[PDB]
Structures are given as C-alpha cells and as structure tokens.
C-alpha cells in the first residue's frame, strides 16, 4: 500500500484506494524543491521586514502591521486553537485519512510556503494510522473548510486528540505512536492548514464513490430483476442508444449487454420473451440510469481535480517572489458537484424501488404475489417492498440541493460561502437510502429466479446469485426479514457486485 | 410517579413525562370494561361461525375465506415474523418506552379485540425497563407502522431481542425479567399490534418536545443578546402586540418582559437605550418567534390527539357487534404536524443565527470585534459564528416537506400513504443543528455581558448568565472552542434553561 | 353589497366577498374618533416640537433629528416614489382591491396617525372600480410589503396608474373616475401606507380561498370516484372517525356521508359492498382530506387575525400620547401559514391523482381500461391521466417552504425577514395544478358513472355529474381531450361543486 | 436566416438562432434516402401482412392484433386527438418553432418510417411563422411529450388552432397560409409524432440560453461594481486559478481580466487598489461563476447531444429491416440538466444580491448609503435591495430538483418517468428572478461610478455604462423607482451586454 506522490497527479482511483483502505505514503522527491523554495521566499519576505498579510501580518487593528517573532509564533498556536470550532459527531478514520492525503497533496506543491517538516508530520501520522478527531459539522466551505482543518491540525500542536486502533488517545500519546513530538508553527502555517476545500472535497469524494458502488450494484440487480420476470434484452439493443447520441446510455447498454449476454437458459426457457412490452423500470434502465453515469461522471470530473488543487490562502509564488490573496477556498465547485451527486443517488434508488415494485405484483411479474408459495398464509416479500419505498422516498426531500443557501459571517466580509459540506455529507445518508433499496431488490430477484425452478441466468448474473445466497437463503415460509435485508446491504457495502462491471466504466474505477 | 392510566386521557406533559424518564403505570380499574367487551365480541364472531376480514380471514384467495383457527394462530406469528422488516439503528430506550405506552393506550380503548393479557404483557415491559429492538426506517406511515411495530411485538413472541440496562438481551431472557414467558396470539391480535400509527406519533412527539425545549432557551438566549448589545426593551411593549392580535406573539412577548424585566442594572448604565433602532433580529423577536410558537402549537394539538387515537384496523365496534375496516393507520395528520414543526424549528435557529451574527459586528453590538479582547492576534468567536451558520444553513433543506410524498405499495392497494416516520425523524437532527446555534448564542450573549464589567442583567437571565459560567469560563485569549460549544450545548439538551419560562405557554409544559 | 365597515372585525367570509367580487363600502361612524384621536396626538407632538422617529424625523443622520416641516411633506412623497420599486406583472384587480380594503382596515383602527381623508381617498377608489397597478414582486414582508404598497399609494398622489374598465388609466384619470384631486401626505403617513402585511396576507388568504375551493370540489370528486368504482362507504362510518378523536377528519368524513348516504342505485348494483378492501386512495380520503382540512383551518385562524391586523409602524396611542417603534411590518406569522396551505393543496391534489389512476386500472375500477369502449383504438383517458400526473408532481417542489429563507437587507439594519409574499403567491399556481387533477378526476368519474348504464348516484353526486355534462358530453370515440379538461377546470374555478359541500365546514364558507 | 439541415447536426449557436427568431428552413438533399428508406420499410411489412407492434397492431385486446388499413389510418387520427390533452397557457411562438425544428430534426434521421410529406408539412408551417398552439403543461417526458406533441400534430390534421401574426387561427386557415391542406396520417406517424422528448429538450433549451445570457450579464455586472467599490484586480490573477485547475473558474477570471484589464482610469484613482480586502462577493467570484459556467456546460453538452437525438419509438431500421421498441421517450438526462441548470441560475442571482448589498453599505461600498447624496431625506436604491433580496431568495425554493419525482401513469406500464418538462420550464422563471437582480446591480454600479466624478472604467464596461445609460438616468434626487428596473430588465432580456463577453466562452455563443 505503499503510495509515492507525485503532488497534484493524485488519480480517482488512487483516491478510492486512500477513501478505501489505510496507506503507507512517502513524498516523491521531485516535490522537495518547490516545497522549500517556497518557505525560502517567505523567509525572505520577513527576514527583508517586508510586510505580507497573511504572512506576518496580525488581525484587524493589526492587519497593517507586522508581527513580533515571538508573537507570530504565538498568532499560529492561536489560529488553531480559535478555529477548531465544530461540532457533531467525529468523522470515521477513512474519511480523516482522505483529508490528511488531500491537505498533503496540497500543501506539497509548493505555492503554501509550509514547512516541509510539517507537511512530513501529516505524513508520518497517515502512515503510523493515527487519526485525529474531527467533528463532522461548522465548515461552510468558504475561505476554506477552517474547523475541520483546525481540528485536524490541533495534534501537530499537541492538542486535541486522535484515533489509533480505534482508541483515543491525547494528542501526546498519539504523536509518539507516529514517531513525532508537538510542533511549533511559523509564519503563514497555521493559514496554510487551515485554508482550503479538503474537508468539503473528501466528503463530496465519499459520496462519488457510493455512487459508484451503487451504480454498479444496481446493474448486476436490474439484469436480476429482468431476468426473474422474464424480460426482454431488446432495451439494450446499441443501435437504439446510438440513435440517441447520450453516452452515459450508450455505456449504459453496453453494461447490460456485458451483464445479461444475447440471451440465457433462464430466457431461452419461455416461447415468448418480448412478446409484451416490458415496463420503464426495466425497459428505460440505460436511459435512466445512463443520466446518472453521466450526473455522476460530471461531477467526478470536478471533484477529481478538486483533489489536486491547490486550495490555501494566500498563495506563495516563490517563482515570482509573489505571495498573493484569492478566494480558491470558497467550494462552491465541490457544492454543485455534491448537489449533482445527489439526483444520481437519488434516481438509482427510485428506479430499483420501481423494479422491486413491479417484481410484487403478480400481474406484472409472472411470480407469485410477494415472492413467496402459500400466499394466502404468507406475506413474503410485502414489508419489504414497503421499507424499500420509505428509503426511496427519504431521498427526494435529501436531495434539495445546500449549493444554493448562503449567510454572511464575520461582519459581511465572508459573505457569501458554498455550504460544500452539507452538500456532501447529506449524500451519505442517501447512499444508505438507495443501498437498502438495492439489497431488497437484490433479495426479490433472486428469491424470482429460484422460483423459476433450475434455470440459470448468464455467468455474471449468476456470481450475483451465488454472492446473496452465500448469505441469505430461498425464502420458503414466512420468518424474520429484516436480518436478511440487513445481510444483503452489508454484502452491498463491501461492494460484493462492484467487479461484475466492466472496468473503466465509473470515474473511479 | 406511578401513571394510573385512564387511556384516551394522556396529556401533554404526561407524554413528556414518559419520553423523558422510566415509568410505572397500571390501567385504571375503568378500563376493563371496554378491554373485556372488546374481546368478548371478537370470540362471539368467532363462535357463531361468522366470517370477519381482520378477524378470521385469510389473506389473498383467503381474504373471504374464513380460516382453520389453529392456522388462525400460525398466521398471527408470521404476521409478525415477515413485517418485521425494518432496517436501520436501533432506536434508543426512550423512544422505544414512549412507543409502546402509546401502543399500550390505544389497544387500552377497547375497539381492538386483543387479550387484556398481551396489554399487560407490554405494561410489564414498560415497568421492568426492558425495552425491544427497533429499527429507526421501514414504516410509510399508512396501514400502520407495521415494521417498527411488528419488531417489538416480536419480543412478546420470544423472538427478536431487547435492552435492559443497557445491553441487549435474548427475547427470553429479557421476557424473564420482566416476569413473563413467550406469548401465542390470537385472532385479530396480530393486527391489532401492528397497525396504528404510534412509531410516527412517537417519532413527531419528540420532535415536539425538542421544538418546545428550544423555544424556551431561545427566549432566555434572546434576552441575554438584548442586554449585551443594549438593545431596547421597547419592542416588547403589550400593545404593540395587543394591536397585531396574533396570540403566539402575544404569549411570547410577555415572556419576553417576564425574563427581562422594564429594566437592568446593564440596561441602566446607558443613556440612550432605545434612541436608534435595534435591527429585525431583536426588535423582531415576539412576531418570528411568535409565529414558530403558534406552529408548534398548531402541531402538538394534532398530535396530542394522534396519541390518544385508536389507529388499528380493523375496529371492532362491541357496542353495535360491528368490525369495521377503516385507515386510521394512514399517518397524514402525523405526517403535516412533523413538517409544521420543522418550520418552527428552523426559523428558531435562523433567528438566533442572525442575533449571533449581530453580537460579531463591531457596528451593531457595541462590543469588541468577535467578543474579544486583544483582537490585534486574537480571533475569538470568529470561527463559533461560521459553526452557526453551517448548522443553521442546514436547516432549510432539512425543512424539505416529506408529507407531500408517496409511492403506492403492495400492487397498488396501498396506492397513498403518508411518509410520517420520515417527516418526524428529520426534526431530531434539525434541533440538533439550532440547539447548536443557541448554544453558540448563549456563549456570546454571556462573553459580550461580561465585558460590560461588573454589570448585571434580570434576575432570571443572571440564572442563565450562572447556568453556563458553570461549565465554561469568560473567554480571555483565544483557547481550544469547541469543548465550550459541546458543554453548553449539553446544558441546553438538559433542559438547563426551560424552567425560565413562564407557566403555561408551552403545550407539554 | 353595501359593506358599512367596522374596523378589525372583518370575517374570513367577508373577506371572501371582497376577494370574489367589487365592493361597496363606508366606515362606520363609530371608527371616527379613534382615527382622528391618533391624528391629533401626531399633530401634538409636532406642534410641541418634540422628536418622534417615524413622524418628524428625517433618516439615517437625519433619523434623530427633527425635519422643517416644509421637508416634512416632500418627504413622505419622496418615500412613496422611491419605495415603489417592484417588478413583475400587475396583480389582477380582484387582489388589488382585497390588498386596498385591508390597509383600509387596518388604517381605520386609529392607530396609523393618518388623516381619514386618505382612509376616504383609499375608499373612494374601491368604490368606483379603481385598481392602482401594483407589480407582483419585491416584497420579502419585514417592515412591510413597502414596495406593492407603495406602487398602490402613488395613485392617491396622482403618480403611477390605475385599471378602470380592464382599461390602464393616468392615475389623474384615474383620481377623477374616483371623484377625487391628488392629494398631499402629512407627517407619518407615508409610513402609515407603505408598511404593513397586507400584500402578504392578500396573497395567501387567495391561496387559502382557493384552497378551500379546492378541498370543497374534492369531496364531491371523491364521492364520484367511489361511485365509478363501486367502492365502499364504510371508510366513512362516524364511529371510526370519532374512535381517532381528529377533528379535520371527523369533519370531513361527516361530508362524505352527507354527500354520499348510506347507499345509492349504483352502489346497490353490485352484490359486495365491502367483501373487498378499498384502495388506499378511496378508503383514506377522510384521514388525508381531513389532515388537509385541519392544515387549511390553522392557516385561516392566522390570516383572519393577520387580516384584522393593525400592521403599520411606528404606532401612535393617543390615550397615552405615546409613539411606539415595534416590528408588526415582520409577516412571519403570514409565511408560515401560506407554507402550511402549501401542504395542504398538493395533498388534497395527490391523492385525487390517485384516484384516477385507480379508474384507469382494469384490474381495479372494474371499468374498461381508460374509460372507453372499443378500447382496441381508442386511448380514452390514457393521457389525461398523464397530465394529471405532470401536475400533481408539480406541487411537491412548490411545496418547498419559503418561511425558512431570509436575506438581510439595509446594511444588516432588516436583518431577518419573512419572505412572506413569495410563500402566498406560489399557492396560487398550486392550486392551479391540483385544480386540473381534480377537473380530470371529476371527467373521468363522471364517465365511469356513464358506463354504469343508466344507474344513479346520490342526489348531491347527480348535481356534480349533471353540472359537468351541461359543458361536456359522454366521451364515446378519441376526440380532442383539451377542450373538455379546460371546460372542467373553468367550471371548478367559478365554484360550480362549492355549494354541494354542507355550511360551516371550512373557514370562509 | 435560410438553413439547410443536415439532420442530426444542429449546433448550440443554431439552436439559439432559431429559438431567438424566425427560420427559413429547407432538409439537405442527403436526408430522402433515410428517410425513403424508413417509410419503405414500414409499408413492406404492412405488405407482407407481418405483425409490427407501433406498426400494424392495435392497442389492449390488439396489442398483439393487426389492424384493418382504413382503421389504420382513423387510428392515427385517434391517437393525435385522444393525446392532445394538455393543460395551462400557451407556449410563445419562438418556443413552439424551436420544437418543431426539433421535430423536423429528429423525424429527417430516417428512423421514424414516416412520409416525407408529413415532414415537409412541419417544415411549411416553419417557414411561414405559422405557430400551433401548445399548452404549457402536461408531459411528465417518458415515452415522450406526448400531449404538446399531439397539440402541435393536431393542425396537421386539421384540427386545433395556430397563431399566425400574433393571431390565433383555425387549422385549414393556418394550413392555407402554409400553402397546405389537412393531411391524413399513415401507420405508425402518430406514433412517430407524438413520441420523444423535443418539447421536454425545448423547455431546457431556452433555460439554458437564459443561463448564458445571464451568465454574460453577470461578468460585465460584477465588473462594474468591482470598479464602482473601487475593487481589486488581483482575484483575477490567472496564477490563482491555474493553481486550483479548475476550468470554468479559469475561463471566468479570464473574462473578468478581458473585460476589466489591467487597471482603469477609475481604479488609478485610488492609491491602493488591493491594499485592503474585498468580500467573497467580489473576491470570489471567479470560483463561484466559474462553478456556475461548468453546470451550464455539463448542461449543454446533453442537451446538445438530445436536440439531435432519434426520440421517438418504436424505431425503424430499415437497413437491417427491424422495428425496435426501446425508451428513448425517457427524458432523465434531460431532466437532470434542467435541475442542474437551476444551480446555476440560482447562484449567479445569488452572488449579484450580495454584492448589490455590498453597494448598499456604506462601510463597504466607499459610497453614500444606499447610493444617493442628500441621505436625510432621500431613500435612493434602499427598496431596489429589496426587491433584489425578494428575487434571489425565490430561487432557493425553486431550485428544488424535479428529476427526483416521478409517479407510474397507464396502469403501471409506464412506471416510471423523468418530469422534464416541469424541470425546465421553471427555468423561466428563476431566470426572470436572476434577470431582475442583476439589472438591479447594473443601475447600482452605473450609479456609484457616476458618483465618481468623470472617471471612466475599461473599454469594455463603459459600452456597458452607455448601454444602461441611454435608457436610465443618473439616480439624482428620490423618484419613481420601478420603470428603471424594468427598463434595465429589458435591455438585458434584449442580449445588451452578452456581446461584450469574449467568444468560444459559452457552449451556445
């Protein structure tokens, strides 16, 4: 796992990787001469008593003026402290993880005039799998993601507390496990921990990737679905999704080619396959589903080189002799592409809801009502099919979109802001929506084909059998449920269907 | 402490009662009469051999066929067994009490035809402190909350599981606590448990009482605001909201002058204390907050009477020898009051958002920049203020109305429900996020008196000056924040500041 | 239609009137000597040269300081031009007219400080039929809705214009159809007309009438489609709704019966009556309607107060001689309650969709598929059921709150705001939508009823289907479909349904 | 305005072409093989008597039934009749022509096996400004747009009504004015009429077009209130954004640096043009427009690729001799780029707001209070802020996503669907609310630079202070607000300052 970083070149994939699993990472050495040319041109603007806001100059009254040594030194402590201001639940150490790697990513390319001994300290904490807490909620993506940065940067100074082996232990414990004593920050470094959009970004980062996950599960499970009723393989036929021109469908269709094959024994074995039309929540599956490829795909695209940006405040441009003020910590990119995610999330799950729907009714399903023998005495599949509308239906308030809500802080001089992370955070939620959807629909298709006593789909659709029945059984007679939709999602969330998809399909995988 | 019950009759503050702490009830001896006629008319149906749908029915084919009575009690635990669907994190204790004294209440009416025994069993889970599993999703709020309800029926059967003390324990095992042993239903009984809308109500109620303990703190937060900024008194003068009629804003004005008084040594210390106008969020306050009383009124009316419903299906009528099926579990009314109360909380938290902004602002609050002292390297509440506005800010997609969805279930029979879990459950995180803001408010409004040096506010608002100052100190220089938020966020979530309010103004207090 | 007006007393049915129809209308002599009592007082303390802000005080610098009084008239004409600042189409006349008679309202109350000959100007116009223009947009309701108020306020000084006859008129013109001269504003009467909820409260108090309408057409719409499908009338049984304890539901079930009896010659034709179980969509309609009854009765308490409001600023006593600065301009109250109608009227139009999606599905209306004979060519209803999907799914996005949003204006002076005009006007074009479901619901049970050869309906049902084949015939062969929907819509617009429902159920009726 | 269509080709700046006004429009020689071939195709296989669903069979009983020829084409004749029933006002003509087009476009790919003549028919009433009339509502866009599409179809029919010279006539006149007479369809050209989503990509069309248009404004607007406020350049810096890598944010600074340059005659004026800071509103709007250019981007691409899209269904191929039913009608992707487009329009509005408030504070503006001298008693642009605020904040609510909504119509076989048409058409009118806020901001910036006496700003924005100018005076003394509002509306709504922005920036320009 061990990753060497070229700064900026950070890929989706590897992205996923660091979201996914802990990493070993060493800075390419390549990056070094950027990085401390950088602090060198700080260096110069003070040891020159030049004056640099931002850089050596205090706050407000003092926003014009430079700084004491001794109390800019103090100004970094202070900043931290001040600013780890959130509040709510501690984020998981994934999502910290992907935090830390973004701010390194950052920080390594040499326009934040950082040490490079700070930038090796997140480094070394990643690597020892030492995580700090840090709230979920107070950042409003706008000068950057300050509380969570802050948070985070808390335990480089020695305070706060981190996670390790899923324990907290006090910032002092912590960085001994990491090989590390607390730090003391100089001019311009608490800004450059603190300014930026990697909170915003990981978390709009987490909710792509359950997109992802959910649009590959939900392929494996509409081709299941279409298989148990007896559907046609016509929908996807390329020449109607060439007819369009929408790649996302076109992609989409190939998909499902790829899935379902020409045909299967489980299709061959009914005189009429097509005979009647198929309804929209299967025969529309690439024209829907193709619009969220292509929502998901947009916004993978900006958060991809939101990843690689260079998001702190003021820029060093040492190349110039330059240090300058923008505004690239208002995430307002990152809004919009969580807002975006969310029709995706949202409209997967509305459509596998339809298909678990149609799967119910008897007229519809050439199945037994509910999925189950002995209907007069059981329920089956019923509730089921109810607990996947509830989830499906929480999706459409979720997806109001946060990339259009706006307050002014701090006396009207930040006055508008992206609110970047709710957007992404709500998405999390809306995956666990549109996942149990999914594993319900899962759970029907494959209790439809058992029925249909025998036959086998196509080879990919019958690994997708074999992952569920790996689990949970045939359901005979009534019992318990809920453990079983329990067993389905769990197998979703370790994207058990995930490799059944062709490769190169999803942004990120 | 021990709740005689008389059902039909919980009020408000009884329902508060027992969301908030354990308790012990016993049915007034007025109850058997109705129970035992209940009963006597479901097993007379069945004596005389009479077919009744809900009764002895089947289901499906068997919906107009009567059922072999020893199949009649198979078919009440697959009920059960196969509703139990749910999915999700377990619901915590107190909701799971206030669910089943809420169950307790309406089977207690006598129009359901069930057992006095299995009442009792629940009323011996409710006072052994045992409380059964239940999962947070699944319910739409129409037929019943069949998946919630059917999972802490499973407890009475020996099946599923429940928490005592803290920890979760086999059916059986916590059956044996609370002195039975595993239950066999009868005829109408599943049902009976099932059906009803007591998961919403109880998801909605206590989203009434969050509402209700954040207006409270919002009145006391509010007048400490006034005071620090030397805002007028003048706003809350009785014929201002005399001449409006609107009595929300009449309730609220007067407590208003309740707390602050005509006067204060603060108060007093400046010339002019109402010569220049206070900006909306002050001089405003009794018509915004006005207006959410009157919501949360509007909503607790609805849903004091929803508690005291009797909503299975269906109902059995002794009196005339009538079972009849209707859709009381079809939670709309549930449903609308939940979104009524988002409205409420949301513009609580939006108008303490902005009374925290004005406090930040040099200009308006005539206090030091972001309430500190030494601002040339200090931030302050800088960064507190940005926290309110996230969760502030969230607060307006989450206000998104779920009573205006539906999917139709169950091949279309259950073709319109009510989408009352989810309108109820979001309200939790959304006085979450202004329980957050008004914590951030009472920190402020406390540091910016405390630089009024040496002076004092009302007598009551000291109370809340002294409630904090408890847990967290005068700021100086700037320190690590967040602790300061959580402890007075926890003091608000301990209801530190409800007992402020005047007698009677809210619903359940 | 002679309205002799006794200030602060006018009824939700008086309002109604004023709405539907023009008026002729006096102030009652009783209502002198207050309103010239708080002319006097102004008149006192600008003659004992005292500083009142509001009434002799100029703005910002000049806010605290007295103005010549010679300024003292070009200011208040200088307010009323420069606050005229909206945009948008002109409102109809029937809602200028109903915005006129309230500011007349609430000036009348002898609180305002104005001279009653502008009350009498202001009477004088609605009298004669003379509606200033006033643009739709611009007000957020917090001090007033200053800008509709404004455009309306320059016809009384000869600026702006005014329709007559459908006719646009020189507001000279204008004055004179009145028989009026332009007149002069004095001291504190600029404000007196400028500030103020009446464009709020005109705007929602048409979105409840049309809600109202709307709920009263739904009864009767429901009750075909019963008839159409053969449906039950046990959903309505009193003991079920009474055993519930709402008071919307009681109600409104309460109209059903009375609409529907007992039994008809169609619900005769068919042996089982109840043997099945009703749709969800037929068999709720009291819990849901009800639900919605309740939402529209809690909105009308808040705007028939509002409506009675004395809503300007600052306010003059004159039994203390007292000025006083408060915040009623704040619609609060008014934005909660359009948000709540908004809940309203998309349910009432979702569960109407409903109901026509259950008359087009063979296996469950026991109609011919879409209502038609010959159903092998011809498409019957088929897509005008699509439309009444299109509108239905409309109403959820509208039904987005906007009580919820607020911008700070005047330098953070009007730091919270209502947004009160923009909840009411979306209303309108919700009601539009469920206007059309339910002229679609209304044709195709009307049809459904045809099919039933020769069978009757109740009494009250037969005047529904009677008033509808007056304007449009039995749909035999495919015809053009829009013409009979428009013709549906025009009739439920003008009310020909409102008088089926019994007296005193809703608000205003 | 002659356009020779190569089917399938049209281009962005086409597309805008003909939305803005009228065409003359002819097929390229190359589209009558295809289309022959189709058309061949379709009447061989009712030659040979063989079974094509969409083709030769009937409907319900017949969907599995061929059809007597004469029936055949009363058939067509039914389907148009029995579709058009749609709802709400009539389209503007512009929008009708663009859908025709859209028609012509999608039927001349040759896959649709309708006649050319019927082709011609559509492209006659093109070229002769013969508009049918299409209502505003009805389609949920999925299987297509049928109602408009039948609307529309009608008048070539002879049936339904057309607007020519803003006068409504008959069909055969209309016809007549086309140089036509009522034609009769043939098999499947009903079909191949009334399916695909041309209205649906319409409605999104004109929304993206009023994105851009806004976009443009919003440049030259933001440029003048940067030089009005006495701004900085420096967020402009291309370092700033090259370091952050995304592209919209580069492409906007770009332009802002275009249209500003490198200094001006006013921002010499000041020594420190950077020294102190600006807001976000100005400071940021490189990554907020820049966000807002990558939706509309991501928007038009789909669009784009939908204007050429092959819609209807079943599909003709003619070279392999195949009739295919797929879903082509499905209109998501469309859907999500209509929602997606709300962002953006929301968001420019939303950023114009804050800096017109920006402009208002006189403790941020460097300019008189609310941009008037002689502030005692003149209000100036105060109530202009206002109705800025009022139009801004509409957009919120409005920007909730359609695409997430959807309800099963037809008796479950069309289950689900996109709402597209509803999505884009609420475009309109949050471009109305963005259109009225920036005009707002144009007089406010054109105000405050003429308050710096005789200084001019760049190249670029004095044609903009000209543009503005020759409609609106100076803001002198208080006056009637509204008509320079409208007035500047109009210019905008006219394309005024769209030139001024460099070419190959929007996806349409």
């Known amino acids: 796992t061990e990753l060497t970083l070229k700064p900026g070149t950070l890929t ?58 001794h109390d800019l030194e103090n100004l970094q402590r202070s900043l931290v402290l001040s600013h780890a201001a959130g509040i709510g639940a501690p984020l998981d150490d994934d999502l910290v993880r992907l935090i830390m790697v973004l701010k390194i990513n950052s920080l390594s390319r040499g326009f934040s005039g950082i040490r490079r001994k700070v930038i090796d300290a997140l480094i070394a904490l990643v690597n020892a799998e030492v995580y700090p807490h840090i709230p979920l909620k107070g950042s409003v993506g706008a000068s950057g993601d300050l509380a969570p940065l802050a948070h985070m940067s808390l335990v480089l100074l020695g305070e706060g507390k981190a996670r390790y082996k899923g324990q907290w232990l006090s910032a002092t414990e912590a960085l001994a496990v990491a090989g590390l004593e607390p730090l003391t920050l100089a001019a311009k470094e608490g800004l450059a921990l603190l300014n930026g959009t990697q909170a915003s970004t990981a978390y709009a980062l987490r909710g792509l990737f359950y997109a992802e996950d959910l649009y590959a599960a939900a392929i494996a499970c509409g081709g ?243 992952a569920l029945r790996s689990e949970v059984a045939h359901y005979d007679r009534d019992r318990f449920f809920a453990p079983d939709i329990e067993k389905a999602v769990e197998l979703l969330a370790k994207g058990s269907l995930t490799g059944l998809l062709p490769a190169g399909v999803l942004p990120s995988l």
């Open 224 to 466: 299941l679905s279409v298989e148990a009723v007896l559907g046609s393989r016509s929908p996807f036929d390329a020449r109607i999704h060439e007819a369009r021109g929408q790649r996302g469908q076109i992609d989409t269709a190939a998909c499902f080619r790829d899935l379902l094959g020409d045909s299967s024994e489980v299709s061959l074995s009914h005189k009429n396959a097509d005979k009647v039309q198929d309804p929209y929540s299967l025969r529309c599956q690439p024209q829907v589903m193709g619009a969220c490829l292509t929502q998901l795909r947009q916004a993978a695209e900006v958060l991809g080189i939101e990843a690689n940006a260079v998001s702190d405040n003021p820029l060093v441009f040492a190349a110039e002799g330059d240090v300058i003020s923008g505004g690239n910590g208002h995430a307002e990119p990152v809004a919009m592409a969580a807002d975006n995610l969310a029709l995706a999330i949202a409209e997967i799950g509305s459509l596998s809801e339809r298909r678990i729907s149609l799967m119910m009714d008897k007229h519809m399903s050439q199945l037994p009502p509910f999925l189950v023998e002995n209907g007069g005495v059981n329920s089956g599949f019923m509730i089921a099919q109810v607990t996947a509308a509830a989830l499906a239906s929480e999706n459409k308030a979720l997806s109001h979109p946060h990339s259009v809500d706006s307050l002014p802080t701090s006396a009207n001089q930040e006055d508008h802001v992206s609110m970047a992370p709710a957007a992404g955070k709500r998405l999390w939620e809306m995956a666990e929506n549109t996942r149990g959807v999914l594993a319900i629909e899962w759970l029907g298709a494959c209790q439809g084909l058992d029925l249909r006593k025998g036959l086998k789909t196509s080879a990919k659709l019958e690994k997708a059998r074999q």
């Open 12 to 69: 989706l994939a590897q992205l996923r990787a660091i979201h996914a699993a802990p990493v070993r990472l060493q800075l390419d050495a390549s990056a070094a001469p950027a990085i401390d040319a950088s602090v060198a041109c700080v260096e110069q603007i003070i040891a020159e008593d030049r004056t640099a806001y931002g850089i050596n100059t205090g706050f407000g009254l003092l926003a014009s003026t430079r700084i004491a040594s």
